[PDB]
């Protein structure tokens, strides 16, 4: 049976996600509009830039993130951002559609639209297989949110200094996750292990994105099309 | 009577302008859409970024610009870009409207819309008075294009090294301009002097833009909204 301290963590993680995930998708009209081989790069870069802001808002509300150094916060965000976007995107991914349903018809993102932004199938087929694998797990929102926080709070990320502190935060998150599953998730005896496997999936999707981002950012007529926040978060700087 | 060498310069300046000014304004739908106190900054920054690209295309076709050093080209573009945008914008400015008619109704830019992008009336009233002063001059397109090239090719710009070379290019442009006016512009005995006065107007509009841009770029939640090309061209770097 879950303690009150563990209960508050869940509450604040859920409240943090609800503040930073807009289910109405009404900001998407602000982006440079989509065009349907680089036709989608302006739109999708505005999209990822918006998502990065939501992830920074999310992270700032994880218990104990605010209290890390600014350097540790930046390092954790620069290596995890792309993984939390892929993870948080599961709530609009559709098994029937194989697409991300983000509101109106202009923001239904098929696999065709998403191959038009500089990245290749070596990134996009695994990412799609990840989405259906993760959808099929049918996570409670509490579990989904716990996983985002565990993913962000990984100490085995390049640049982190206070390893032991970040590791203690993540450990207490994992305890809550395993306990929640055992007690509140029927038939979830294997689910903790699968979720941790999906975190490994995420590491691999990260490397392939970083490798391909490198090729975009070395072409100044492409990186020109990104946003300042993307250039800063995905930069090597 | 104008020589053939001077005639070719006019021809190539006119051809350069026609290649880089799209009278249909059909790229404007690509920009982040307008919103009608910073509501217009995303749209207007995409606008100015697009214009900067047209000015680089224009400059690359001025006789002798291509042959300057990359450093001299960059220095001339970083100090003159904002002035050539203001100058080239005269072709869509309207005395009746006091607005820039750029195609459809979403791209009619009144004085209200243009005060919604971080800049104040200290910049916007002079700029509007400049536009009606310049419209009232009724320049032939040859004169308008000659002035853009003379403005770009000024050697009294911070960063230029080959002063004497840039000055010789500009001098030969001025000769063509005074000769054209004398021979092809009826009643233009005063027009050369007014145009040079408008170049002085431009220097003043430049300082005030630079001063106010400084304030935008010191607020990271505003400079975040600019484009990479704007940050690079208007940067102090």
């Amino acid at each position: 049976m879950l303690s009150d301290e563990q209960m508050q963590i869940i509450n604040s993680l859920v409240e943090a996600h609800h503040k930073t995930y807009d289910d109405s998708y009404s900001d998407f009209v602000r982006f440079r509009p989509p065009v349907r081989r680089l036709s989608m790069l302006p739109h999708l870069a505005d999209l990822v830039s918006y998502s990065i802001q939501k992830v920074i808002g999310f992270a700032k509300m994880i218990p104990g993130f605010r209290d890390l150094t600014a350097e540790d916060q930046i390092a954790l965000l620069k290596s995890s951002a792309i993984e939390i976007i892929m993870l948080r995107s599961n709530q609009s991914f559709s098994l029937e559609d194989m697409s991300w349903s983000c509101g109106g018809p202009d923001f239904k993102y098929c696999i065709n639209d998403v191959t038009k932004a500089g990245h290749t199938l070596e990134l996009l087929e695994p990412l799609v297989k990840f989405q259906v694998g993760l959808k099929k797990l049918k996570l409670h929102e509490e579990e989904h949110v716990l996983l985002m926080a565990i993913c962000l709070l990984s100490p085995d990320r390049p640049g982190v200094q206070d390893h032991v502190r970040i590791e203690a935060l993540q450990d207490r998150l994992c305890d809550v996750l395993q306990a929640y599953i055992r007690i509140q998730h029927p038939g979830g005896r294997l689910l903790y292990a699968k979720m941790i496997q999906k975190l490994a999936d995420l590491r691999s999707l990260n490397e392939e994105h970083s490798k391909q981002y490198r090729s975009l950012s070395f072409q100044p007529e492409h990186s020109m099309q990104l946003t300042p926040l993307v250039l800063e978060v995905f930069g090597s700087e | 009577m104008l020589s053939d060498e001077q005639m070719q310069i006019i021809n190539s300046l006119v051809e350069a302008h026609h290649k880089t000014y799209d009278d249909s304004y059909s790229d404007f739908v690509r920009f982040r859409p307008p919103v009608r106190r910073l509501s217009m900054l995303p749209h207007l920054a995409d606008l100015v970024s697009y214009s900067i690209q047209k000015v680089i295309g224009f400059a690359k076709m001025i006789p002798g610009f291509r042959d300057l050093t990359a450093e001299d080209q960059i220095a001339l573009l970083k100090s003159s870009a904002i002035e050539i945008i203001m100058l080239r914008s005269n072709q869509s400015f309207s005395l009746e409207d006091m607005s820039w008619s750029c195609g459809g109704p979403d791209f009619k830019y009144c004085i209200n819309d243009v005060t919604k992008a971080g800049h104040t009336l200290e910049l916007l009233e002079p700029l509007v008075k400049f536009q009606v002063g310049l419209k009232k001059l009724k320049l032939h397109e040859e004169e308008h294009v000659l002035l853009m090239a003379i403005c770009l090719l000024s050697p009294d710009r911070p960063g230029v090294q080959d002063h004497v070379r840039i000055e010789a290019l500009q001098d030969r442009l001025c000769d063509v301009l005074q000769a054209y006016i004398r021979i092809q512009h009826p009643g233009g005995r005063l027009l050369y002097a007014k145009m040079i006065q408008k170049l002085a107007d431009l220097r003043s509009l430049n300082e005030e833009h630079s001063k106010q841009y400084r304030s935008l770029s010191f607020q990271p939640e505003h400079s975040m909204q600019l484009t990479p090309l704007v940050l690079e061209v208007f940067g102090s770097e």
């Binding site: 916060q73 800063e232 700087e237 | -």
Partner: peptide, 10 residues
């Protein structure tokens, strides 16, 4: 370094 990030982190 990381001007925007430092800002968004308050």
């Amino acid at each position: 370094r990381h001007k925007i990030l430092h800002r968004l982190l308050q």
